[PDB]
Amino acid sequence: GGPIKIIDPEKVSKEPDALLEGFEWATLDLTNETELQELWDLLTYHYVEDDNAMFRFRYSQSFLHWALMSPGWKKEWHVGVRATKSRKLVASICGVPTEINVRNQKLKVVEINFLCIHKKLRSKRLTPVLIKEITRRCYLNGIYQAIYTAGVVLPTPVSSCRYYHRPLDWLKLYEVGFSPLPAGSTKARQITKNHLPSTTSTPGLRPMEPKDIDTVHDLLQRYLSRFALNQAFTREEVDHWLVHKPETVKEQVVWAYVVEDPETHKITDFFSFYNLESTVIQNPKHDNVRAAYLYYYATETAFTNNMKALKERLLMLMNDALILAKKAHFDVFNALTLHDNPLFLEQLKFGAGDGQLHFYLYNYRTAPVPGGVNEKNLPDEKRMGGVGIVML
């Protein structure tokens, strides 16, 4: 595979394309509290399909710092559009840089996300204008490839992964209309089905500490390198994305845990998940769903190439993840069919969700990579080894 087109950054326009009359380009300064608040307010009410949505996200300053101010981040890649007259921020699109491996070719990219347009400015084709502009700002700044996910069907997805959801408080998820009641099932039966143990099982499980950064970085690298398409974290990335900083982060976003071998004291596994809350719109019983999203993990057992051993170790580790998330008062535990997730999603009672998240690469062509599912969109242990990157 390889790039699709070569960019000459000296021929890249120094000025952005036209916007709809009455709007103007903005660069968001997320270090400025009022501008951070502007992005948050736009996302809170407008990062939603339309007025009919039953859920919106609840962002926090902590989440936005974690998502958008990762190592190498640039304010030029926090793109906004404002209404000229009111100054209101009406759209956004963001990138942060990272390195990925695409079938053994190292690639500097940006990960693009937080594309969002004010509900009242939809269907005006501002989206391609936002994409072309952040593209322009990346081209000017060293970067000619990007990686991103979307639910929308765009050409040539590099992979597609199915959504899965493990009920931690099933009743709440039923009451807000997310989890169905099967059959001749009953609420009590679904509550029993989802009941978790109160204590973890993996010997040596403990919260990750900053002293674990190096060994987690190394383990994660060796583990992800096994996947056709994967993220090549630096040490700084591990510190940013994986180590909660209670001094400086007001509302914890990442939960990370390691397994310190009881005999060797070497860390032999870790996993992590992040918190992104959903607002429940006008439900008289609940107004939020606390969702945990499975993030990165790794285990020394993978390197034996013994799939039965690996399944066994992941079943233990991920059930401990659920137990920890439940103890932490999360209501649901979300994951995709990427990594070795098909080894454990179904058995740990993750429910299959609707449709697929697609992964794309911009300006890079490679054979599609297996996304953890077969052609029937069912988790398949023969269709892993493909997607070794997750995105928030």
Ligand X SMILES: CCCCCCCCCCCCCC(=O)SCCNC(=O)CCNC(=O)[C@H](O)C(C)(C)COP(=O)(O)OP(=O)(O)OC[C@H]1O[C@@H](n2cnc3c(N)ncnc32)[C@H](O)[C@@H]1OP(=O)(O)O
Half-sphere exposure in the Cβ direction for 362 (13 Å, CA): 22
Query: Is 131 known as a binding-site position?
Result: no
Residue 336 corresponds to which amino acid? L
Q: Which of residues 99-138 bind ligand 2XQ (CB under 6 A)?
A: 113-114
Least separation in angstroms between residue 132's CB and ligand X is 8
Least separation in angstroms between residue 139's CB and ligand X is 6
Q: Which lies closer to ligand X via its Cβ, residue 131 or residue 328?
A: 131
Query: Among Cl ion, ligand 2XQ, ligand X, none, what binds residue 134 when CB lies within 5 to 8 Å by partner kind?
Result: ligand X
In the block, which residue shows the tokens 């242990």?
Answer: 381
274, 249 Cβ separation under 8 angstroms: no
Residue ranges with strand state E in 118-195: 146-150, 159-167
Query: Is 117 known as a binding-site position?
Result: yes
- Stretches 2-10, 79-87, 161-169, 322-330: which one binds Cl ion (CB under 5 A)? 161-169
Residue ranges with strand state E in the chain: 2-3, 23-27, 55-58, 78-83, 89-102, 105-117, 146-150, 159-167, 205-207, 229-231, 254-260, 267-280, 288-299, 332-336, 351-362, 364-365, 387-388
Q: Does 143 bind ligand X (CB under 6 A)?
A: yes
Query: Among ligand X, ligand 2XQ, Cl ion, none, what binds residue 334 when CB lies within 5 to 8 Å by partner kind?
Result: ligand 2XQ
Token couple for 368? 């599609």
- Stretches 29-37, 123-131, 217-225, 364-372: which one binds ligand X (CB under 6 A)? 123-131
Least separation in angstroms between residue 17's CB and ligand X is 14
Query: Is 127 known as a binding-site position?
Result: yes
Terminal Cα-to-Cα distance of the chain (whole angstroms): 26
Query: Is 100 known as a binding-site position?
Result: no
Instruction: Give dist(CA 361, CA 367) in Å, integer.
Output: 11
294 is catalytic: no
297, 256 Cβ separation under 8 angstroms: no
Token couple for 177? 């209309």
Query: Among ligand X, Cl ion, ligand 2XQ, none, what binds residue 178 when CB lies within 5 to 8 Å by partner kind?
Result: ligand 2XQ
Q: Does 279 bind ligand X (CB under 6 A)?
A: no
Query: Among ligand 2XQ, Cl ion, ligand X, none, what binds residue 128 when CB lies within 5 to 8 Å by partner kind?
Result: ligand X
Instruction: Give dist(CA 70, CA 10) in Å, integer.
Output: 27
Question: Closest Cα partner for 230 from 5, 69, 391?
Answer: 391
| Binding residue for ligand 2XQ, selected from 90, 224, 291, 369, defined by CB under 6 A | 291
Q: Does 174 bind Cl ion (CB under 5 A)?
A: no
DSSP 130: H
Helix, strand, coil percentages, rounded to 5, for the chain: 30, 30, 40
Q: Does 173 bind ligand 2XQ (CB under 6 A)?
A: yes
Q: Which of residues 45-74 bind ligand 2XQ (CB under 6 A)?
A: 47, 55, 57
Query: Among ligand X, ligand 2XQ, Cl ion, none, what binds residue 3 when CB lies within 5 to 8 Å by partner kind?
Result: none
Instruction: Give dist(CA 159, CA 277) in Å, integer.
Output: 26
Q: Does 190 bind ligand 2XQ (CB under 6 A)?
A: no
| Binding residue for ligand X, selected from 9, 128, 210, 355, defined by CB under 6 A | 128
| Binding residue for ligand X, selected from 100, 110, 220, 321, defined by CB under 6 A | 110
Query: Is 124 known as a binding-site position?
Result: yes
Q: Which lies closer to ligand X via its Cβ, residue 54 or residue 191?
A: 54
240, 216 Cβ separation under 8 angstroms: no
Q: Which residue in 294, 310, 322, 392 is the catalytic one?
A: 392
Query: Is 126 known as a binding-site position?
Result: yes
Neighbours of 291 (CB within 10 A): 24
Least separation in angstroms between residue 170's CB and Cl ion is 17
Which is it for the CA torsion 172, 175, 179, 184, positive or negative?
Answer: positive
Pairing assessment for the beta strands 2-3 and 229-231 based on DSSP bridges: unpaired
Q: Does 122 bind ligand X (CB under 6 A)?
A: yes
Query: Is 383 known as a binding-site position?
Result: no
Tell me which residues touch ligand 2XQ (CB under 6 A): 47, 55, 57, 113-114, 163, 165, 173, 176, 178, 276, 278, 289, 291, 293, 332, 334-336, 353, 392
- Catalytic residue numbers, as ranges: 392
Q: Which residue numbers belong to the known binding site?
A: 115-117, 123-127
